[PDB]
Amino acid sequence: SRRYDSRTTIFSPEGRLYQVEYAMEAIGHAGTCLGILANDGVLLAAERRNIHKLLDEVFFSEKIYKLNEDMACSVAGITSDANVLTNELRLIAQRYLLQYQEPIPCEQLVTALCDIKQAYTQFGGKRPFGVSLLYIGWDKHYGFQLYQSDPSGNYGGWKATCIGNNSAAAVSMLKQDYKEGEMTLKSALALAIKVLNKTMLSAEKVEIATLTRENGKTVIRVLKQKEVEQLIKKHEEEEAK
Amino acid sequence: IGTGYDLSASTFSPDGRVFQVEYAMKAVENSSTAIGIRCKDGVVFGVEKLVLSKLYEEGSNKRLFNVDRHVGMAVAGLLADARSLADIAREEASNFRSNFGYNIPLKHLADRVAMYVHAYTLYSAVRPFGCSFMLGSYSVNDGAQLYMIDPSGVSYGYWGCAIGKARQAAKTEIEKLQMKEMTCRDIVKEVAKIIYIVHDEVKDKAFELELSWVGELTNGRHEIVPKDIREEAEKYAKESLK
Amino acid sequence: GSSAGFDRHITIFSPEGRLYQVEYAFKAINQGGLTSVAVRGKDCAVIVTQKKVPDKLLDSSTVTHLFKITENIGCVMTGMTADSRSQVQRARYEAANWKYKYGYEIPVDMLCKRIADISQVYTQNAEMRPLGCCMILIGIDEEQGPQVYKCDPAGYYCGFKATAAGVKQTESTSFLEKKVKKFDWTFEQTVETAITCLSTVLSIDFKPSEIEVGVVTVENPKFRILTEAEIDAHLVALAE
Amino acid sequence: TTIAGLVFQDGVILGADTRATNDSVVADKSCEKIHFIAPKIYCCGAGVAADAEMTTRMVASKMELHALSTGREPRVATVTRILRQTLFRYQGHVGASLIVGGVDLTGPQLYGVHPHGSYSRLPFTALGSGQDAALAVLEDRFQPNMTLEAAQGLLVEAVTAGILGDLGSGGNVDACVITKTGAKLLRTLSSPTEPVKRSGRYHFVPGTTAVLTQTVKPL
Amino acid sequence: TTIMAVEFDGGVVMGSDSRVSAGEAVVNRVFDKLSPLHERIYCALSGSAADAQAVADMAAYQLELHGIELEEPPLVLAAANVVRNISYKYREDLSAHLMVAGWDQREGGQVYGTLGGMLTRQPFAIGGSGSTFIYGYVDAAYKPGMSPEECRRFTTDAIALAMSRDGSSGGVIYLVTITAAGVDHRVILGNELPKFYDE
Amino acid sequence: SIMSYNGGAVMAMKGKNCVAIAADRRFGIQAQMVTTDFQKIFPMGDRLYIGLAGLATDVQTVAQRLKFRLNLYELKEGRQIKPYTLMSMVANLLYEKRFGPYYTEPVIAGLDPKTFKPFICSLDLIGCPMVTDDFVVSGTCAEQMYGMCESLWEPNMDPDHLFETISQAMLNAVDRDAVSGMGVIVHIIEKDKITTRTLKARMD
Amino acid sequence: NQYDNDVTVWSPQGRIHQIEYAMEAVKQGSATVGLKSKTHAVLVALKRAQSELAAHQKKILHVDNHIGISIAGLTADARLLCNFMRQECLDSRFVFDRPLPVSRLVSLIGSKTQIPTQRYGRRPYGVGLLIAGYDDMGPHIFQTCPSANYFDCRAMSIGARSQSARTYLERHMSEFMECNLNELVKHGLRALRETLPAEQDLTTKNVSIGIVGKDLEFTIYDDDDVSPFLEGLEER
Amino acid sequence: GYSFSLTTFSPSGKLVQIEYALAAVAGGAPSVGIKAANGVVLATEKKQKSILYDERSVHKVEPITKHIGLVYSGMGPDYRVLVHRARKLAQQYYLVYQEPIPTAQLVQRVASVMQEYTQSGGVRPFGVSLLICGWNEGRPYLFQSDPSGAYFAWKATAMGKNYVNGKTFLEKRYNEDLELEDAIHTAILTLKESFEGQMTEDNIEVGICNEAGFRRLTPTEVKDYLAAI
């Protein structure tokens, strides 16, 4: 028994949690997934890895998950692990709603899942969840929000961020073209395609979703392939000129 | 085969063996010899109980036990394991009477206890018993019955049986006896003779002979062989050696 | 045939997707030294195995590999004897439990599927080892006629026209397929096929105490174990 | 409720009324008391309607798992046992009184299962508040090996006697015939009460109801 | 209900009426209360129908596995202890009496009482609501050394005598004769019952 | 009775291609009225509503525990629930408390996703589903409601006819119930729209 | 090498090295001697001091009015075993209102201490005891070990240099049954002093005595209470 | 039991036990699923080692409920565990919602159990990849669930021995507008691409799903499909 134990919840000589660090490597191999905050909304733009000709495409998305009436998320890592976490996110959002009769504020939903992810690093002897998440949302306290959380259970709020393949290159590219406070969903969608083009471009290989506020109610919408095509050719035109 | 394949009972070796059980069987083979003989009117047990120290009392470390009023147990191997099996066997017999209102049939007791033994041969969590033992019984309905269980959990019925250092040597001597037509009074003298023959006076120190029997003579009750009959069998055993 | 980590010590996949510990449990069956044959006929099913009693010091009637699971279901176990007894106790439990919950006797296939499913758990959980034994069950089905089923330490199970287990399993199956290819499958033709398979494969001209025969018949579905005199009546007719 | 069973020459007939009562008030004029267990096993429920509904649903679901695993048609003994052992465990607190009828490899069978978990294999039976009216018709005219037409006729009469004699029973007679070849669910096989007619002139002119608030949500 | 068992040389005779009631209402008028616990071991059921059937189902199950483990037909004493223990452990929650009778290679034909978790061997025994009115009859009519036919006649007469007097008893008398050879099932119809003073 | 501690009434009615759902607005404890605007009908979809009569805590609790399961269901399923399926969801929620139940008797009124077929039903306090093709009632004035509904209901009622019928059946029933009233609210659920109306009702 | 780590691992020789390692704890505790006559059971033990300033450790503990023990090994395991024994004794007097028969108590120790020798992650007791008792079978001297085996003894010695003490008990064995209390205790003291170095003798500071018998309940003598017995010793 | 995970992340970021479980699948007998316009086909190689095997005794194509069916590649005994679990899960849904479980819903529930065996302590992942077919909301469904617990909705796909070739063969050979009568023929031709020997109605197994639910084709039905091949 001691022989077969992997020791997944222990520190290395330099104060490192190796399973947590190896979980992150898994996320680097997953498809690129970026989030951009704007004044009139917030978006999620991810690379599609289920890109074979004989796929049925039954669901409305591949990587984009609705969690709440006001929140959505995207994943990068082990997709089965991500199914567990998104399902738990939906249960946490309903436990809050049942109790307070108001939707869960964005940061609180992220912290709650991150406390489950952290527990996998400190006790139990199990491997961690090999997933990183990008959360988009709206709440009555901080309005449009964009979060990111990694397998360690650590999280942060962002104005633009990227996870998955070539995440590093995309964050340096977003760092240059992001105009804090002067961004709109129209300009941010242009930036989302501009970034994914370099870090990877058919509307079959991409998947975009937006979160906006229409008539005092939140509107979450995954863009249609034609919509994505019109956004790609509006950039293809600017690249040639 | 010292390559990890022999550290757990939940691990088979590449040739399909469970070495933890084989190493537990070795603990019995290293121990002193115990013999049991089934005859026309009962079952008789005899044990070569080596005297480790002159300081110990006569009758210390009794390798013969009463598992039930009609059942007896002869052990060879790691004594604390052997006594723990005696308590299991006892409780098994006790639970049969509480369930069905009559004495546990010997093959049934052998079957039940052999599976508590078997259970310890499947996991990394527990260790096999380093013990082999015999169960003897006599009733009018079932007749004379002798069974033996090994560390692997195997239970077989016997006419004659030996366990320990001299298991094979005692077997070629029990084979000379025509026990199927003998009494327990007759077979007692022979059990002592066989134990004295297979004893190693050079390699081993002094020994004490333990003799027990269950048969028609005892009214189906497992008893120690009285001092009177034991002295008579030990006298014949020594006289035969010369 | 690569190894990585503890794939030869516990039931975890090897680089090729194999379960070395399960493979070793099949080799444990042969450690017993015996071989077993089972043949299904037009209206019967017979199981026959070796009966090696080396010392006259044993009580020959307690040395057996044939077992009664239920009144109409019997089995021949091949492999590690205590592992085999363990599986027979569980088979008996599962069968009695089935009739208690469902009010009808367990079908041969359902008892086989059940024991095979129990065996699979050992194949997936690491803290315990597979059983080093093979179970072959026979019985007469109310609407399916005579049944012969076998289950593995792997958890696999199946129905058969004829089957074998143990040391000379491959040769016994090679022989059994040659006879089924070419007969009116009567009780005598089913019994003899099984006896002469064990005999020609082990190259032993049997004595009535050297083998044990078990049978289920459509006329008498109760699992019956053959006497030495009954075993001899077949052995002598085979020599004729 | 008036639920009834019969065993004829080629199978079983199950009968039921369509009244659900909530304390001397008829809540439902046409409920379904004959429930499916397996293709050739049906069950009539009487008592606490939720208990009859859920214990029938649970055993039907358990019989699908049974048949899927075995690969065979389920036996009526299995449904009787699964039901009894569940009801006994609840000690009569699950108030379902059932009439299980069906056909398996061992022929047609009819069983009465009571809320405490007791059962009987019967050639004819009746349960519910109107069981005595049905049991009188069955005792009076049951003969073994009845023809399908003769058995249907007797069953309809047995349920009808309960419909008119029991205040806790009414509506139509629902029936189910189960034979070696399957089951025919004869809903509203008989209607002992001819279509109820009124001279209803209860029309309200639009605007007669005084409205204080009005909001319209387009969809 | 009226149940009865009688020991004889080669075995036992067990009888019962056929009435299942629910208050003053006869629910089943042809119930067989002699339930087999093994080939050659039977029990006669009385009291709560649900409790009696539950105990019989569990006892037959326990005895089936017990028999297969001993590679032998269970002893009637073992079957009596099996029923008795269940009736005793659950005596506060059970309201059934299961009389146990049958045959053995060892002790031949034996009759047992299980009333409220107790255990008693009887040359003959009676149970159920109907037994109250035939105590004086069985005390006068029982003679030792009765043949199996004489046992069936003693059982039929005593049960018919109780059936007439007891509202909770009636219908038909089911007879069962357990012997080394096997079990015989008889049914005495309500038309064929023995006649005595009934006014 | 426990159900009469708070009082109230709920009713649902079928239409040719529309459905109606109505309830009173009293919230009172025993003989004392607390508020005159208590909500007893809750939207479960675009064209699906549930009305709960009985003990005010359990009306609120059942509605909230049902909305929890509903939201999770629509998230996993990616579709709006069918009216019949919502009934089965309430039956299972109520039956879970079989031996210690919620004191509420629901009524469901909605339209089939085939954007048409009206659906009405009711459940007892232990979750027994009951679908009808006419009307369903639940309240302290169920006897009054049955009388009004049985007399007033007609088969293929137009939305306007349905409105007058359900309004008159609620008003006249709750006007003979001491612990029901303080106004009536009615929802008319058509394919194209929902019309919510509060009636001018007695205030005693 | 690999067969040293856990008690559940059998070595290829049919040995359990963890049990053997636990027995090394007993051999490293200071010498204790137990012996019996026809009426008495005596426990005589040497008490080591961890420095001149520290006191000589309590080697003899009370179990019941008819039972007393002397320990050798892990003192924390000795306390664990002592409280189990004290409690088993309490249960017997509570239930039966009679002393727990000494041989029965010793069987419970063997049964209790065998359990962790067959369970993974568990370890045997690192304690060996000498038990002095009196019951309907007269006086008794028992020996328990980290291997769950136990022995009925006429006399015995466990611990550091206990071989020297064993030799005196074997040579004087015959005189013990007819011995009076003063003589039986002196025999115990002589066996104890044979383990002691050549330069070292017995002392009213390092000697501890425990006596139980026909009229005496288990009593522990330690310093000036030990003086009357030492006042008879005369040589080597 | 063993409370620690047996599947952990290698330094390169791979869950190697899941990779090794996928190897067990890639070495199993081939299976095919084809989503036709009016139905779904499931086809597999049921070739056993000798004539002595009673082919009719055990099945690879299995029903879950009236409208859902199943097939696999990999470890046979592992599959049986998932079949029982799937049938149970389908009854739990029906008991609550009183509606046949949607195929996406069954596939999701089953895939959750598969994920569990990649993280729960002292167990290895399943050495099986399942092809699940169903009929709900008047339309056909074809899904695949692999040892990691990941699911995929396919129009047509292959698993087991020679799946790379079968998957290219399916892509080019047929496309949308397939009648179920045409799809069965294609599934058997995809299998004939790997099969070693004469392909009979006793060594291949087919199952169909349509408006009438899911059912396994009889050997006489398979024989008539093989009469045209």
Ligand SMILES: *[B]([O])([O])[C]([C]C1=[C][C]=[C]C([C][C])=[C]1)[N]C(=O)[C]([C]C1=[C][C]=[C][C]=[C]1)[N]C(=O)C1=N[C]=[C]N=[C]1
């Ligand atoms: B019957 O009259 O006994 C009836 C049985 C019933 C009713 C509806 C649906 C089914 C399907 C299995 C069965 N039971 C009732 O009417 C009961 C009240 C009752 C109880 C005992 C004796 C007589 C009547 N009513 C309900 O439980 C109920 N009524 C309306 C709506 N939901 C439940």
Ligand SMILES: *[B]([O])([O])[C]([C]C1=[C][C]=[C]C([C][C])=[C]1)[N]C(=O)[C]([C]C1=[C][C]=[C][C]=[C]1)[N]C(=O)C1=N[C]=[C]N=[C]1
């Ligand atoms: B008898 O009168 O004691 C009879 C015996 C019995 C035992 C097992 C099985 C059955 C039939 C399934 C019957 N029991 C009854 O008739 C009892 C009522 C009784 C009990 C004691 C004295 C007089 C009468 N029946 C029931 O408990 C019962 N039967 C049907 C419906 N509900 C309950």
Ligand code: NA
């Ligand atoms: Na394992």
